[PDB]
Symmetry: D2
Subunit: 296 residues, 4 copies
């Protein structure tokens, strides 16, 4: 199977006067490339995919593809939907725009059955010839891709190569790699990056790496080399910021931190997302002061 693994970043989407700040978007991706990141994920959850137009989806994916040309860095495009016909369309568009693979979140809100999830992802996988990574985040979608369903999709669909897990469930992480060790388990939960990697996970899709890409990169590559002492040390050091970045729903804290570090020009969200409370604004700033933040 063709795979996309390593240290990866769920890119925030900067706004300027209500529109995508395309120059800032490119600059942020270049900063990720220059700090050891192996792949970037445009228009995922952290990129506020739910409130972007389809034209803005295309714009962000195109900027990512253009910015990564001539480098080893891959573009793993967000391309999921609650509707199978739309997810298929978004997958084909991402492939057409030059993405290296797609990240496809489990359908949110309508709670498909496992049989429905299987048919959903089978249709997506058959629509493109680039790698497809599943994305399980039950706290946001209201459903769970079961271990058996993930494994069947991995075994039955050539291009589906693993899953990004954001489920706080290390038992499931053991279950997955014990019964199908060929899959690429990817951490979607920064605080437990090291435990997932040390059980044989092969990468992360990180929120924290927006702010600290070098530290997440080093953690991941230490772990992939089985230098678990050094990987755990970084995971432990990062725990405080990893947690404070979820004091309100992601991406409210990470966008706040990027603004606080001068990495984006405006603290703009698209409704229903909005600025954090004053108290959390201050708490994020205080945690940030403990970390070494790379510039441009």
């Amino acid at each position: 199977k063709n795979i996309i693994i390593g240290a990866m970043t769920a890119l925030i989407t900067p706004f300027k006067n209500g529109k995508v700040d395309e120059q800032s978007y490119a600059r942020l991706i270049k900063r990720q490339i220059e700090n050891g990141i192996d792949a970037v994920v445009p228009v995922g959850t952290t990129g506020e995919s739910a409130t972007l137009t389809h034209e803005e989806h295309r714009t962000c994916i195109e900027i990512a593809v253009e910015t990564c040309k001539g480098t080893k860095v891959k573009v793993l495009a967000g391309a999921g939907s609650a509707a199978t016909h739309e997810a298929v369309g978004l997958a084909k568009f991402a492939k057409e725009h030059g993405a290296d693979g797609i990240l496809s979140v489990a359908p949110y809100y309508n709670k498909p059955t496992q049989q429905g999830l299987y048919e959903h992802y089978k249709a997506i996988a058959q629509s493109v010839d680039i790698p497809v990574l599943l994305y399980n985040v039950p706290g946001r979608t209201g459903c769970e891709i079961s271990t058996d369903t993930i494994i069947k999709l991995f075994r039955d669909c050539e291009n589906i190569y693993g899953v990004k897990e954001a489920s706080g469930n290390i038992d499931k992480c053991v279950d997955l790699l014990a019964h199908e060790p060929r899959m690429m388990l990817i951490s979607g939960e920064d605080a437990i990056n090291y435990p997932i990697l040390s059980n044989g996970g092969k990468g992360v899709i990180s929120v924290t790496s927006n702010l600290l890409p070098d530290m997440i990169s080093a953690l991941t590559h230490f772990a992939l080399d089985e230098n678990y002492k050094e990987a755990k040390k970084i995971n432990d050091e990062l725990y405080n910021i990893n947690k404070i970045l979820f004091c309100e729903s992601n991406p409210i804290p990470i966008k706040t931190a990027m603004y606080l570090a001068g990495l984006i020009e405006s603290l703009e969200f698209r409704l229903p997302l909005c600025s954090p409370s004053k108290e959390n604004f201050a708490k994020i700033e205080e945690v940030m002061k403990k970390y070494k933040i790379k510039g441009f």
Copy 2:
């Protein structure tokens, strides 16, 4: 406040060869009108709103408005989204097409804060001059509209008149009506229709009423008339079917039941929804036989 209350039906959306069966849709609404229902909800969760196109949303709302014209049955159109700009557009769209009010689900997947939910619904309410009913269903959305946020929205926004609760939380139902008894609490969970109504709830938005509109409307009208003995009698009699209609994610069982009862021509869903398991298909068919199902 202008309100829309009483016995209401979250209409299924029948498909024929992958398209909305417009004649069946009108025929089903006529059947609701003839069995005492007070309002119909096109393109809600039960109507597979997530997989319909915007043109299909318009078609369903237009059929609902036309079929109810001259009958005093109101149209409470589903018009929610994870994106405030889209939810506002859908609200204005529903008003333009003649809806009497809108049902607007809490944003799914992106988990707005309470502050964001307030700004979200404030924007929606300000965009139209028809009643707006909030819809809280945390098991599907991943977020909860708190009692404080619901009450602030009710008091601050002229058009917001209540909430459809699908949360299995009778404590919260007491909390809501004890602190703001002027709001219209609407049951969004059929099995507990009577407990919500007997605490001062003023209506239901029902799944079961697709199949048994006469029984759900009588239950609601018994309760609103303070005949709690007879309202509870129907709620108790309905418990078995009320539960089996969620043995898989709604609307998979109710569409199965409508097909089994001869009320729709084909058991078609849009992916990622699909037919139930063979065992659940059998369980639904067995529970249905204990009830008298009105024809056309």
Copy 3:
């Protein structure tokens, strides 16, 4: 079946210098009798059953029996355990000391299966000839007596006449009385006393009635008389105090309130229970000032 229903109080156990204050206990029970209560529950959860000795269990039950002599007020003795042999012994114990019935909590900590729960309660019921009320509180015990198991026990064992539910699950309350309308469903959660009674529940076992016995007895008796309007009025008025009495684990707040009202001499718990935080102490004091607390 012989039954014990109506307005009932889960009695606090006052301590003086670490010992059960027998004079205060009798005085508090008399205050319940004089304010319309139908039965009292010595040495339940609210009575700190977990930290009392077997001899202190005896003392409290005997005082309850003695104080109720010459009145209609029943003694429904706490007599449950995680060990079946101990629960049997405590049941016979309670009957020997003159109790009118027993309240028997589901085994905590060891998580028996439904078959084990059936055998547990069958053994208890066969050990005495007085009524036995089941008590389901999964947040405390770690297990749930299912509806099916409750109904089988009710139908198979002469003495088992119902269940006290503290489970935040009005759906289950419908389930229970829809399938077995002959049982006595008793509210174990004060905030939802009225919804449980209006669905056909026949009593409450209350924490709040320790402080406000007249209001809880009036609420229950209105509901039993089918004056649902007047019962709901009291339930709504009591919501604030009903909630603040669980701002920390019961009985920490109710003992605090009894101390603040001058009804017990000292704010004494047995470890691991202890005084509330200063912040919660103040919140309890403020909520109390909206209510008329009967003296002796």
Copy 4:
């Protein structure tokens, strides 16, 4: 004072077994109990836990609690194997009494479960464990299992207890919460985190946990011991390989509430004479009995 964290703490770590308690005609089978502990000793186990959850502590009498601790202490004499006695209670006065008892009968330390059923606050848990720790001079391992107790010892409370009390040296976690496991050792790396959930033994050890208190080791003591000692030597390949191989049995041993499956498995393997529980525990369903039997076929089960 608040500065015990780097002062000398006696610890009990390594591969440890939560011993089942065999019954014969309703009584503790004392000969079987001794024989089972011998089998653990001979298969590389570092400590045994008498009368914990797996030992049906809830249904044993105080006298049976006594007898089981005494047999464990006597059987482990003359070996390296430690006795970490179950000694917890929902009542602080009883937990103190059980702690002193375990010390006076020769236990090496105590495992003290968070109070069940009465749901103490964090302040109450702190005072609870401070009282227990001050009553003895032997090591105390906290035990957090919220699915059974209805309460949680928070990370801050565990760390405060470690720093404020001389003899509290760590926590057995059975909480399905690897985030909390990171939280604990990132903020207080000096404590001994012990796995209380067999399926995730390797993830807990690879994050710096220093032992397991195992259900599976009743049946497969050599495998759990090997897993633990590989991990302690930082042979993470070998440790993970065993953890993966054990997943099927690790999960099926909880298809019904522990210890119903493990006693069923011990009976099926001929290691105990009768499948007897004390009510309210009882035999598994016939379907789960068969599932346990089938999962066992994958594994090499040591005899006596």
